[PDB]
Amino acid sequence: KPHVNIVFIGHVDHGKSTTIGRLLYDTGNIPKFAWVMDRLKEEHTKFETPHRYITIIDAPGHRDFVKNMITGASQADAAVLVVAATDGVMPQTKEHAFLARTLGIKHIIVTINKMDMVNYDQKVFEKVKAQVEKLLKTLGYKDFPVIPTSAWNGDNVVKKSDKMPWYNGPTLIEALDQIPEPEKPIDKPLRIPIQDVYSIKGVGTVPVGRVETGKLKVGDVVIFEPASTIFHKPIQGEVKSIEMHHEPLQEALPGDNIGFNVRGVSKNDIKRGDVAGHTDKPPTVVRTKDTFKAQIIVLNHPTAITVGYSPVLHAHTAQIPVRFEQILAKVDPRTGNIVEENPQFIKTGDSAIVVLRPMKPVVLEPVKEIPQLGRFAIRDMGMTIAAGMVISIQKG
Ligand SMILES: Nc1nc2c(ncn2[C@@H]2O[C@H](COP(=O)(O)OP(=O)(O)O)[C@@H](O)[C@H]2O)c(=O)[nH]1
Numbered sequence: 001k002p003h004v005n006i007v008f009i010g011h012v013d014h015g016k017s018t019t020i021g022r023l024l025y026d027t028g029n030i031p032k033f034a035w036v037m038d039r040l041k042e043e044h045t046k047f048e049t050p051h052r053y054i055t056i057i058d059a060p061g062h063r064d065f066v067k068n069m070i071t072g073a074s075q076a077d078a079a080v081l082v083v084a085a086t087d088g089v090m091p092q093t094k095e096h097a098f099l100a101r102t103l104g105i106k107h108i109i110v111t112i113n114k115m116d117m118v119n120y121d122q123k124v125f126e127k128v129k130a131q132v133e134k135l136l137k138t139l140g141y142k143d144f145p146v147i148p149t150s151a152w153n154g155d156n157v158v159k160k161s162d163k164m165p166w167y168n169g170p171t172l173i174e175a176l177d178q179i180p181e182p183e184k185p186i187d188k189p190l191r192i193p194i195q196d197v198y199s200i201k202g203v204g205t206v207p208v209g210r211v212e213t214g215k216l217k218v219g220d221v222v223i224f225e226p227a228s229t230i231f232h233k234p235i236q237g238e239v240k241s242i243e244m245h246h247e248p249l250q251e252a253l254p255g256d257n258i259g260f261n262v263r264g265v266s267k268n269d270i271k272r273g274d275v276a277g278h279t280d281k282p283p284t285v286v287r288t289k290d291t292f293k294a295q296i297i298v299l300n301h302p303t304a305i306t307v308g309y310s311p312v313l314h315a316h317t318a319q320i321p322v323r324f325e326q327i328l329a330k331v332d333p334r335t336g337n338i339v340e341e342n343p344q345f346i347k348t349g350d351s352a353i354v355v356l357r358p359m360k361p362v363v364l365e366p367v368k369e370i371p372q373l374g375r376f377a378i379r380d381m382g383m384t385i386a387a388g389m390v391i392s393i394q395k396g
Pocket residue numbers: 010011012013014015016017018019113114115116117149150151152153
């Protein structure tokens with residue numbers, strides 16, 4: 001049985017806790033329902049399905065929810081978006097779906113909860129379903145289940161409802177049982193951030209780095225960025241050999257720290273913070289004429305962060321000066337929800353959505369595409385100011 005991590009999102013009071021509660025209650029996984037729900041409120045929990053081991057890895061409402069999601073300390077394979085049939089899709093529903101998209105969560109399960117409060121009505125479910133479909137289509141999601149539920153009464157969480165014969169789809173627990181296995185780093189495009197560059201006599205130019213994603217084989221042609229962008233010509237060549245622990249390899253996989261000899265590349269053309277990829281799928285370069293959106297959590301700062309702040313960005317093996325161009329939103333670190341648009345400043349403990357401009361070219365990837373190159377730290381004044389994740393890149 002494959003292990004799978006899930007997170008429950010959705011607007012406050014739409015029924016995330018109750019749904020989790022009901023799941024645990026009906027599968028006999030508790031560590032009257034009303035009593036029990038009280039006890040749970042006061043105090044990771046796993047449960048087992050026929051085909052899956054399921055961990056609820058994190059949840060909106062605790063101190064480090066946004067931090068854990070941003071740093072990748074908490075990582076979900078699927079998100080269950082809870083939407084109340086009474087309220088429908090609210091702004092905070094849209095925000096949370098955007099967050100799931102940003103994190104590269106590919107599988108979404110929607111529950112339309114509190115069906116009992118709208119008399120289990122089909123017309124109501126369909127109206128809300130249509131709102132849910134419009135939002136998730138906007139974000140690129142397709143073929144996700146939309147499940148009418150009453151977390152309080154039990155309908156369609158674990159047991160099939162006798163109150164909604166018009167619904168033919170799966171229950172929540174049946175939808176969780178069908179969460180596809182996580183995509184593997186080996187199947188993402190090759191990326192090798194360069195740690196150091198050596199010249200070995202009789203051999204030539206030998207970069208050293210850890211394969212983060214994809215697979216490097218002897219004979220592959222690799223291209224280096226931002227070296228290629230900086231020098232206005234492709235810095236690339238054939239991989240003649242691979243070594244680890246002073247022994248030959250024919251291929252290198254995610255996690256392998258390797259030396260690789262590249263034909264036709266000069267030692268001076270590549271350095272620390274360059275990244276190797278296939279010419280087919282070259283590492284993305286954010287130039288100084290470009291910008292990028294990021295979600296950050298402010299870990300420490302002596303005063304407050306404002307537009308124009310210019311610290312150092314650290315990602316993979318690179319470091320560059322970066323400028324804060326805009327702060328688009330202040331984000332509650334507990335919920336992941338927006339509490340202010342266009343705030344003037346950000347302080348320790350705040351999360352924010354920011355537009356950053358690299359002051360030197362840098363390889364960055366949106367976390368939704370390649371997370372190993374989409375997470376970064378901000379450093380300044382001898383400390384770690386912020387942890388961040390790349391949302392998107394805007395070319396100039
Ligand atoms: N009638 C009804 N009440 C519900 C349902 N789901 C949650 N509630 C109640 O609505 C309130 C908010 O639910 P909660 O799980 O705390 O929401 P969260 O903030 O999303 O975790 C609580 O009083 C729940 O007991 C439901 O399906 N039907």
